[PDB]
Each structure stands twice: as C-alpha cells, then as structure tokens.
Design an enzyme around this catalytic site. Structure first.
Site, PDB file in Angstrom:
ATOM      1  N   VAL A   1     -14.989   5.031   6.593  1.00 44.86           N
ATOM      2  CA  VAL A   1     -14.918   6.507   6.515  1.00 44.86           C
ATOM      3  C   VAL A   1     -16.558   7.075   6.059  1.00 44.86           C
ATOM      4  O   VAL A   1     -16.946   8.659   5.370  1.00 44.86           O
ATOM      5  CB  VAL A   1     -14.509   6.962   5.514  1.00 44.86           C
ATOM      6  CG1 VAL A   1     -13.651   9.054   5.575  1.00 44.86           C
ATOM      7  CG2 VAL A   1     -12.859   6.239   5.927  1.00 44.86           C
TER       8      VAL A   1
ATOM      9  N   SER B   1       1.038  -1.530  -0.076  1.00 42.61           N
ATOM     10  CA  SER B   1       0.430  -0.406  -0.488  1.00 42.61           C
ATOM     11  C   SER B   1       0.529   1.344  -0.060  1.00 42.61           C
ATOM     12  O   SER B   1       1.638   1.445   1.267  1.00 42.61           O
ATOM     13  CB  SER B   1      -0.335   0.104   1.267  1.00 42.61           C
TER      14      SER B   1
ATOM     15  N   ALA C   1     -14.596   2.254  -5.135  1.00 42.21           N
ATOM     16  CA  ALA C   1     -15.327   3.101  -6.712  1.00 42.21           C
ATOM     17  C   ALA C   1     -15.812   1.489  -6.693  1.00 42.21           C
ATOM     18  O   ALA C   1     -14.968   0.539  -7.880  1.00 42.21           O
ATOM     19  CB  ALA C   1     -15.159   3.644  -7.929  1.00 42.21           C
TER      20      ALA C   1
ATOM     21  N   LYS D   1     -11.504  12.115  -8.412  1.00 42.09           N
ATOM     22  CA  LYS D   1     -10.185  12.464  -8.476  1.00 42.09           C
ATOM     23  C   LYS D   1     -10.290  13.906  -8.611  1.00 42.09           C
ATOM     24  O   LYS D   1      -9.535  14.456  -7.997  1.00 42.09           O
ATOM     25  CB  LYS D   1      -9.558  11.400  -9.175  1.00 42.09           C
ATOM     26  CG  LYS D   1      -8.870  10.112  -8.360  1.00 42.09           C
ATOM     27  CD  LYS D   1      -8.171  10.167  -6.761  1.00 42.09           C
ATOM     28  CE  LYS D   1      -7.963   8.537  -6.409  1.00 42.09           C
ATOM     29  NZ  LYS D   1      -7.314   9.079  -4.828  1.00 42.09           N
TER      30      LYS D   1
ATOM     31  N   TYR E   1     -10.355   4.530 -16.155  1.00 45.87           N
ATOM     32  CA  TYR E   1     -10.722   5.422 -14.393  1.00 45.87           C
ATOM     33  C   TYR E   1     -12.424   5.405 -14.798  1.00 45.87           C
ATOM     34  O   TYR E   1     -12.245   5.348 -13.367  1.00 45.87           O
ATOM     35  CB  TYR E   1      -9.662   5.952 -15.174  1.00 45.87           C
ATOM     36  CG  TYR E   1      -9.166   6.390 -13.434  1.00 45.87           C
ATOM     37  CD1 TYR E   1      -8.442   5.601 -12.473  1.00 45.87           C
ATOM     38  CD2 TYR E   1      -9.377   7.875 -12.529  1.00 45.87           C
ATOM     39  CE1 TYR E   1      -8.519   5.775 -11.447  1.00 45.87           C
ATOM     40  CE2 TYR E   1      -8.769   7.813 -11.278  1.00 45.87           C
ATOM     41  CZ  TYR E   1      -8.528   7.099 -10.692  1.00 45.87           C
ATOM     42  OH  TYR E   1      -8.137   8.030  -9.346  1.00 45.87           O
TER      43      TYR E   1
ATOM     44  N   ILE F   1      -7.380   6.850   0.914  1.00 44.22           N
ATOM     45  CA  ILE F   1      -8.385   6.463   0.875  1.00 44.22           C
ATOM     46  C   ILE F   1      -9.086   6.078  -0.365  1.00 44.22           C
ATOM     47  O   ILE F   1      -8.966   7.478  -1.267  1.00 44.22           O
ATOM     48  CB  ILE F   1      -9.367   6.042   2.179  1.00 44.22           C
ATOM     49  CG1 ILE F   1      -9.298   5.294   3.464  1.00 44.22           C
ATOM     50  CG2 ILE F   1     -10.910   5.262   1.876  1.00 44.22           C
ATOM     51  CD1 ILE F   1      -8.725   7.469   4.309  1.00 44.22           C
TER      52      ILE F   1
ATOM     53  N   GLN G   1     -10.288  -0.501   7.795  1.00 43.47           N
ATOM     54  CA  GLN G   1     -11.816  -0.031   7.921  1.00 43.47           C
ATOM     55  C   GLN G   1     -12.429  -1.113   8.501  1.00 43.47           C
ATOM     56  O   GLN G   1     -13.345  -1.348   9.783  1.00 43.47           O
ATOM     57  CB  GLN G   1     -11.913  -0.467   6.142  1.00 43.47           C
ATOM     58  CG  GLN G   1     -13.501  -0.106   5.556  1.00 43.47           C
ATOM     59  CD  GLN G   1     -13.570  -0.187   3.959  1.00 43.47           C
ATOM     60  OE1 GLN G   1     -12.503  -1.324   3.585  1.00 43.47           O
ATOM     61  NE2 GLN G   1     -14.324   0.255   3.679  1.00 43.47           N
TER      62      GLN G   1
HETATM   63  N1  LIG Z   1      -1.611   3.451  -8.581  1.00 40.47           N
HETATM   64  C1  LIG Z   1      -1.893   3.240  -7.836  1.00 40.47           C
HETATM   65  O1  LIG Z   1      -1.720   2.508  -6.778  1.00 40.47           O
HETATM   66  C2  LIG Z   1      -2.186   5.114  -6.923  1.00 40.47           C
HETATM   67  C3  LIG Z   1      -1.977   5.869  -7.844  1.00 40.47           C
HETATM   68  C4  LIG Z   1      -1.893   7.497  -7.212  1.00 40.47           C
HETATM   69  C5  LIG Z   1      -2.818   7.239  -6.330  1.00 40.47           C
HETATM   70  N2  LIG Z   1      -3.790   6.096  -5.425  1.00 40.47           N
HETATM   71  C6  LIG Z   1      -4.135   6.777  -4.267  1.00 40.47           C
HETATM   72  O2  LIG Z   1      -3.164   6.470  -3.359  1.00 40.47           O
HETATM   73  C7  LIG Z   1      -4.191   6.065  -2.034  1.00 40.47           C
HETATM   74  C8  LIG Z   1      -4.215   4.540  -1.699  1.00 40.47           C
HETATM   75  O3  LIG Z   1      -4.100   3.277  -2.765  1.00 40.47           O
HETATM   76  P1  LIG Z   1      -3.145   1.733  -3.111  1.00 40.47           P
HETATM   77  O4  LIG Z   1      -3.727   1.882  -4.563  1.00 40.47           O
HETATM   78  O5  LIG Z   1      -2.148   2.264  -3.106  1.00 40.47           O
HETATM   79  O6  LIG Z   1      -3.406   1.298  -1.942  1.00 40.47           O
HETATM   80  P2  LIG Z   1      -5.061   0.312  -0.945  1.00 40.47           P
HETATM   81  O7  LIG Z   1      -5.414  -0.633  -2.721  1.00 40.47           O
HETATM   82  O8  LIG Z   1      -4.665  -0.821  -0.301  1.00 40.47           O
HETATM   83  O9  LIG Z   1      -6.049   1.892  -1.281  1.00 40.47           O
HETATM   84  C9  LIG Z   1      -7.252   1.420  -0.673  1.00 40.47           C
HETATM   85  C10 LIG Z   1      -6.989   2.063   0.902  1.00 40.47           C
HETATM   86  O10 LIG Z   1      -9.038   2.220   0.774  1.00 40.47           O
HETATM   87  C11 LIG Z   1      -9.219   1.744   2.533  1.00 40.47           C
HETATM   88  N3  LIG Z   1     -10.573   1.586   2.318  1.00 40.47           N
HETATM   89  C12 LIG Z   1     -11.338   1.296   1.156  1.00 40.47           C
HETATM   90  N4  LIG Z   1     -12.099   1.511   1.388  1.00 40.47           N
HETATM   91  C13 LIG Z   1     -12.664   2.421   2.504  1.00 40.47           C
HETATM   92  C14 LIG Z   1     -13.244   3.348   3.142  1.00 40.47           C
HETATM   93  N5  LIG Z   1     -14.931   3.050   2.992  1.00 40.47           N
HETATM   94  N6  LIG Z   1     -13.184   3.301   4.162  1.00 40.47           N
HETATM   95  C15 LIG Z   1     -12.090   2.953   5.088  1.00 40.47           C
HETATM   96  N7  LIG Z   1     -11.352   2.387   4.614  1.00 40.47           N
HETATM   97  C16 LIG Z   1     -11.390   2.129   3.168  1.00 40.47           C
HETATM   98  C17 LIG Z   1      -8.272  -0.036   2.877  1.00 40.47           C
HETATM   99  O11 LIG Z   1      -7.618   0.098   3.879  1.00 40.47           O
HETATM  100  C18 LIG Z   1      -6.848   0.377   1.489  1.00 40.47           C
HETATM  101  O12 LIG Z   1      -5.741   0.805   2.657  1.00 40.47           O
HETATM  102  C19 LIG Z   1      -5.995   5.783  -2.582  1.00 40.47           C
HETATM  103  O13 LIG Z   1      -6.449   7.063  -1.872  1.00 40.47           O
HETATM  104  C20 LIG Z   1      -5.321   5.976  -4.353  1.00 40.47           C
HETATM  105  O14 LIG Z   1      -6.440   6.563  -4.931  1.00 40.47           O
HETATM  106  C21 LIG Z   1      -2.920   5.240  -5.426  1.00 40.47           C
HETATM  107  C1  LIG Z   2      -3.595   3.733 -12.132  1.00 39.24           C
HETATM  108  C2  LIG Z   2      -4.585   3.269 -11.415  1.00 39.24           C
HETATM  109  C3  LIG Z   2      -5.146   2.943 -10.960  1.00 39.24           C
HETATM  110  C4  LIG Z   2      -4.741   2.640  -9.247  1.00 39.24           C
HETATM  111  N1  LIG Z   2      -5.649   4.150  -8.633  1.00 39.24           N
HETATM  112  C5  LIG Z   2      -4.649   5.044  -9.268  1.00 39.24           C
HETATM  113  C6  LIG Z   2      -7.010   4.319  -8.602  1.00 39.24           C
HETATM  114  O1  LIG Z   2      -7.232   5.344  -8.208  1.00 39.24           O
HETATM  115  C7  LIG Z   2      -7.748   3.204  -8.620  1.00 39.24           C
HETATM  116  C8  LIG Z   2      -8.979   2.777  -7.773  1.00 39.24           C
HETATM  117  C9  LIG Z   2      -9.972   1.964  -7.678  1.00 39.24           C
HETATM  118  C10 LIG Z   2     -10.887   2.342  -6.732  1.00 39.24           C
HETATM  119  N2  LIG Z   2     -12.116   1.208  -6.596  1.00 39.24           N
HETATM  120  C11 LIG Z   2     -11.459   0.305  -6.493  1.00 39.24           C
HETATM  121  C12 LIG Z   2     -10.538  -0.522  -7.642  1.00 39.24           C
HETATM  122  C13 LIG Z   2      -9.482   0.855  -7.777  1.00 39.24           C
HETATM  123  C14 LIG Z   2     -10.175  -1.731  -7.804  1.00 39.24           C
HETATM  124  C15 LIG Z   2     -11.172  -2.229  -7.303  1.00 39.24           C
HETATM  125  C16 LIG Z   2     -12.179  -2.426  -6.392  1.00 39.24           C
HETATM  126  O2  LIG Z   2     -13.382  -2.747  -6.868  1.00 39.24           O
HETATM  127  N3  LIG Z   2     -12.656  -1.442  -6.661  1.00 39.24           N
HETATM  128  O3  LIG Z   2      -7.182   2.023 -10.894  1.00 39.24           O
HETATM  129  C17 LIG Z   2      -7.150   1.975 -12.424  1.00 39.24           C
HETATM  130  C18 LIG Z   2      -8.592   1.996 -12.571  1.00 39.24           C
HETATM  131  C19 LIG Z   2      -7.942   1.766 -14.495  1.00 39.24           C
HETATM  132  C20 LIG Z   2      -6.954   2.573 -15.212  1.00 39.24           C
HETATM  133  C21 LIG Z   2      -6.171   3.035 -13.812  1.00 39.24           C
HETATM  134  C22 LIG Z   2      -5.390   2.547 -12.886  1.00 39.24           C
END
Ligand SMILES: NC(=O)c1ccc[n+]([C@@H]2O[C@H](COP(=O)([O-])OP(=O)(O)OC[C@H]3O[C@@H](n4cnc5c(N)ncnc54)[C@H](O)[C@@H]3O)[C@@H](O)[C@H]2O)c1
Ligand SMILES: Cc1c(CN(C)C(=O)CCc2cnc3c(c2)CCC(=O)N3)oc2ccccc12
Ligand SMILES: NC(=O)c1ccc[n+]([C@@H]2O[C@H](COP(=O)([O-])OP(=O)(O)OC[C@H]3O[C@@H](n4cnc5c(N)ncnc54)[C@H](O)[C@@H]3O)[C@@H](O)[C@H]2O)c1
Ligand SMILES: Cc1c(CN(C)C(=O)CCc2cnc3c(c2)CCC(=O)N3)oc2ccccc12
Lengths: 258, 256
Positions: free
Chosen positions: A65, A19, A95, A163, A156, A92, A40
């Site tokens: 949340v 994470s 979708a 976002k 996306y 957090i 969560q």
């Molecule tokens: N490619 C990427 O992974 C990427 C890139 C840019 C930004 N982000 C952002 O960084 C954040 C972390 O994403 P990640 O992919 O690095 O790890 P991740 O998948 O673990 O993040 C999801 C988190 O959401 C929490 N969660 C889900 N729904 C919840 C709710 N309603 N209330 C409380 N907890 C809940 C979980 O504890 C989990 O740690 C997200 O906001 C994501 O949009 C991620």
């Molecule tokens: C990068 C990238 C990510 C990572 N990112 C920045 C995100 O913001 C991911 C968000 C996300 C939100 N909700 C869910 C999931 C991912 C996966 C499974 C699930 O059930 N629900 O996700 C994508 C989805 C489509 C295209 C690009 C990306």
C-alpha cells in the site's frame, strides 16, 4: 442465509491466524460474504492463499500500500473477477520498530512520522480512491484504530498520531462518500496479542493490567472484533457512518481501578 | 503582566492579520520578552518590522520542512536565549489543490505527506530541537481547527493533519510533563486571516455569526489572550488540552 449474504468484501492485512483480519474474515464468511484477500510480500503469498482457500476464495492478490501503482494494479486484477463489489477492510498498520521504543519525543523522527502516517492513515484513502468506481450502492468501508488515537499511551508514540489522522480520515471519507451510498467506519479495538504485539515492551504485563481494569474483565479477542466488523460492513449498520466504534470491552470509558 | 519574566518564541507571523501577530502583541502586552521566526526571505522584512515594534531584536530564519533549519535556528537562538520558556507553533500548510471540492478526489499521497509534515510533525520536531533549552514551567502552544474533530467541507486533509497535531499535543504533553514542560492547543474558530486565502465560501462560511452562541466569529485578540494565558503560569494546571476558542460554535448544533 446470514447477513452479508449478497456481499463481496475485500480483506487486507491477513498475515496470520492470529491477525485481526483473520478473525474478521472468519466472521464475514460465516455470515456468507464472498471474500477476496491481499498480501504485502511474496513471503505471505503462500499463507494468505491457504487462509483464502479455507474460507473458499480464489481471489488472492498482492498489494503493497506504499505504492499508488501497486494499489491500482490490484484493483484492476480484482476488477477482472469482481467488476463491482461491496467494500473492503483496512487492517494495515506500520511504524519503523524503533519509533515505538521509549520516550515519544526522543524516538520520533521525520521519516518515522512519514512512514507511520503514510501506511496507517493515508493508505486507507489511497485504497478508496482506487476502487471508488467499483463500489456498489449500500457498500461499506472499515478500518481498525486504537485508543492511542484519543489518548497518550506510553511507547505507542507516533502511531497514536497516525491513528488520530486515520480516525479523522474515516470522518472525511464517510462525509465525502456518503451521498453515493458508501459508509465508512472504524473499530477502535482493545489490546490483542497478534503480529503487532512483538517486539513491544512489557506487552505481557500490559495485558494483565488491562484485563483487571476493563469492565468486561477480559481482554478482547479477534472473534469479538470480527463480529462487530461483519456488522459494520453489513446492511444492519446502514444507519452508522463516520463512527469510531470502541470494541474495547469498555476499557476506554472507565478510569482509576482499583 | 502575568507573562512577565518569560521568554517565548513566536512563529508563523506574516501579516498584521496573522494569528501569531495577535498572540505576539497580546504576549507583549503582558510583559513577556519575544523572539520571532520567518519562513522565507520574502517574510524577513515584515517579521523584522513587527519584531522592532514589540521591542524585539531576535528574528531568525526557520523553515520547519528541514531539520537542519530548525536546529540552526535554535542554535542561533541559544546564543541570546541559552534557556527560555517555550514557543508558539502557529504554522500550517497544504498544497492549495488539496483544499477544494470532494475530499477523496482532492487528496493525494504527496498532498497528505506535506500537510502532515508541515502542520503536525513540525510541532514535535521543534520541541525535539529545543528540549535541552526549556526552563521548568515552560509552555508549548499550537493552533488547531474543528476540522480535526469533524468533517468540514473543503478542509479535507488539513483536518487529518490537525487531528494528528492534536494527538501530538497529548503525546508531547505526556513525554515532556515530568521535566516541567506543558503542551496545549487552541482550536480557534474561523478568522478572515490567513493570509484561508483562495478558500471557497469563505464569507458565507464567516456567517457562523448567526449560529455561534456569542453571536460573532472569534478575533485575533481573543485567541491572543487565550494563547498568552495558556503560556503563562496562570495555566499551570492545564496540559495536553485542546481548548476550543470559537465562541462555543463546536458545542452547538442545528441553530437554524
Ligand atoms: N492490539 C492489536 O493488535 C490491535 C488493536 C487495535 C487495532 N489494531 C489494528 O488492526 C490492524 C491489524 O493489526 P494486527 O495486530 O491485528 O495484525 P498484523 O500485525 O498482521 O497487522 C499488520 C498487517 O499489515 C500488513 N502490512 C504491513 N505493512 C503493509 C503495507 N504497507 N502494505 C500492505 N500490507 C502491509 C500485513 O499483511 C499485516 O497483516 C492494524 O491496523 C492495527 O493498527 C490492532
Ligand atoms: C496495543 C499496542 C499495539 C498494537 N497496535 C494497536 C498497533 O497499532 C501496533 C502497531 C505497530 C506498528 N508498527 C510496528 C509494530 C506495531 C511492531 C513492530 C514493527 O516493526 N512495527 O502496539 C503497541 C505499541 C506500544 C504500545 C501499545 C501497543
Ligand atoms: N485563520 C483561520 O481560519 C484559522 C482557524 C483555526 C486555526 N488556524 C491555524 O492558525 C495557524 C496560522 O494561521 P493564520 O490564520 O495565522 O494564517 P498565516 O498564513 O499567517 O499562517 C500560516 C503560517 O505558516 C507559515 N509557514 C508555512 N509553511 C511553513 C514552513 N514549512 N515553515 C515555516 N513557516 C511556514 C507562514 O509563514 C505563516 O506565518 C495555522 O496553523 C492554522 O492551522 C487558523
Ligand atoms: C477555516 C478554514 C481555513 C483556515 N485554517 C483553519 C487552516 O487550518 C488552514 C488553511 C490553509 C492551509 N494551507 C493553505 C491554505 C489555507 C491556502 C492556500 C495554500 O496554498 N495552502 O482553511 C479552510 C479551508 C476550507 C474550509 C475551511 C477553512
């Protein structure tokens, strides 16, 4: 002592060692911040308590949340140990899986839209409302966004709107809370393979294509963003508020390669 | 008329001061055929009257909070316009309490929910419903504000909704592009109508005139012309764009 020495920071969204929130916590502890964590579900309780214990933290509190009451109870529990503290990290995002599958306007639904915007954009203010009275002067709030906020990225879908809403949220929050010594910023992170990378379509090939055309010529890691995050929540960033910092490797500012 | 031969659905007209009224009569002037919608039984009369003044007979009930209402509206429109050339999305709302004082204190989850439901989602929800009916070279338009891109006092969560709306414009443009549909937004400067009703400066705010390059605030006619252009074939090379129609206020800074 490193920077963030006298600081107390709450870190959400640590669901794994992969994470982004883990990478951020590691950096903030290395720089000497006293941390607290949330989870969560009770499925995560076991894991988060250990990551917190490794990082030297007794504070590990449940919080979904989606619920106003859940958020209030958590900051009440945190108040028992941290009457006042120095900010938090909003990592957090959600979708309903099916919302991110194919064509945007086909996939999108009123409920998918609501949940996405509630959990990924509003959640951030909800949390700031709940702990506003506990924040110290010079305190800092941070969230995590993606380029989908600024651009149309396939599959996306609704998340890009959530976002976009979130990045505007950072702006209004920063503006509202500035005067009382609170800065609010965001990191627009590049693509990383974390728990949000599954079950996303074509994620393997997407990272390969992304690592070829990103100027730095590699895909960003949770250490790079953890470092920026630590800086953004530190007094080194005292002059930065309401900013969406691209921890992208320079991907967003380039176009047409090769 | 550079909009001649086009059939375009205009929403969100509730007054002669209304922004869609300016768009509609600008759209009418250029020989377009117009259809209208009204949200309430309250509005029905006024929207029927202006529809008649512009030579339109097509006036339909539509609350965009309900999916059924939208589908029933486009179903009813289908009987007269089985196919048409896009619509204008001039709709926005947040509970009044939301648009007053400190953003963080004002905002609520429900206020955030409605703001985003009515002001951003409704746009794609409407496109969703009528996608089947959209002719090649159709154009969709919506209206936004600088509060999307910057933090304006007492605009509050509407700014977030608008930001979402502007992102929605890009995703809609990217999805619907391949079928010959275009989707854009006009980020209009402040205008006295709506309906803006019960807003705090406001005339103090209306003194953008001193700071705005063109030395005045933008009018319903200015937006109307641009909206007509954006929905014409003249703007065939523009899609997914947020065109600022505010006299260059956005691009200036610190004009005393
Ligand atoms: N490619 C990427 O992974 C990427 C890139 C840019 C930004 N982000 C952002 O960084 C954040 C972390 O994403 P990640 O992919 O690095 O790890 P991740 O998948 O673990 O993040 C999801 C988190 O959401 C929490 N969660 C889900 N729904 C919840 C709710 N309603 N209330 C409380 N907890 C809940 C979980 O504890 C989990 O740690 C997200 O906001 C994501 O949009 C991620
Ligand atoms: C990068 C990238 C990510 C990572 N990112 C920045 C995100 O913001 C991911 C968000 C996300 C939100 N909700 C869910 C999931 C991912 C996966 C499974 C699930 O059930 N629900 O996700 C994508 C989805 C489509 C295209 C690009 C990306
Ligand atoms: N007037 C300004 O200062 C200004 C500036 C920039 C952008 N805009 C945008 O222009 C658009 C229209 O604003 P206006 O200035 O013409 O005032 P207005 O009050 O006439 O327009 C608001 C419209 O929303 C409609 N509406 C509200 N909730 C609805 C719902 N759920 N379903 C259906 N209809 C509903 C009303 O019928 C009304 O026509 C808004 O989207 C606003 O965001 C206005
Ligand atoms: C400009 C401007 C506007 C107009 N505008 C561009 C808008 O986008 C929306 C205005 C608006 C939306 N919803 C409601 C109201 C006004 C009044 C009463 C009500 O119940 N709901 O509103 C502002 C509010 C504060 C600051 C600037 C502005």
């Amino acid at each position: 002592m490193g920077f963030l020495s006298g600081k107390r920071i709450l870190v959400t969204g640590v669901a794994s060692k992969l994470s982004i929130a883990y990478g951020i916590a590691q950096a903030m502890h290395r720089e000497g911040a006293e941390l607290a964590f949330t989870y969560q579900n009770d499925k995560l309780k076991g894991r988060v308590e250990e990551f917190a214990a490794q990082l030297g933290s007794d504070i590990v509190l449940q919080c979904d949340v989606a619920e106003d009451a859940s958020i209030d109870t958590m900051f009440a529990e945190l108040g028992k140990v941290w009457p006042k503290f120095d900010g938090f990290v909003h990592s957090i995002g959600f979708a309903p899986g099916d919302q991110l599958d194919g064509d945007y306007v086909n996939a999108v639904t009123r409920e998918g839209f609501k949940i996405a915007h509630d959990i990924s954009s509003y959640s951030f203010v909800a949390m700031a409302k709940a702990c506003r009275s506990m924040l110290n002067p010079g305190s800092a709030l941070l969230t995590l966004s993606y380029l989908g906020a600024e651009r149309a990225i396939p599959n996306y879908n609704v998340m890009g709107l959530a976002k976009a809403s979130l990045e505007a949220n950072v702006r209004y929050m920063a503006n509202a809370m500035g005067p009382e010594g609170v800065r609010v910023n965001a990191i627009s992170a590049g693509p990383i393979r974390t728990l949000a990378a599954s079950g996303i379509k074509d994620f393997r090939k997407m990272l390969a294509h992304c690592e070829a055309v990103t100027p730095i010529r590699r895909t960003v890691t949770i250490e790079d963003v953890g470092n920026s995050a630590a800086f953004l929540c530190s007094d080194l960033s005292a002059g930065i508020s309401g900013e969406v910092v691209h921890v992208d490797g320079g991907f967003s500012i380039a176009a047409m390669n090769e």
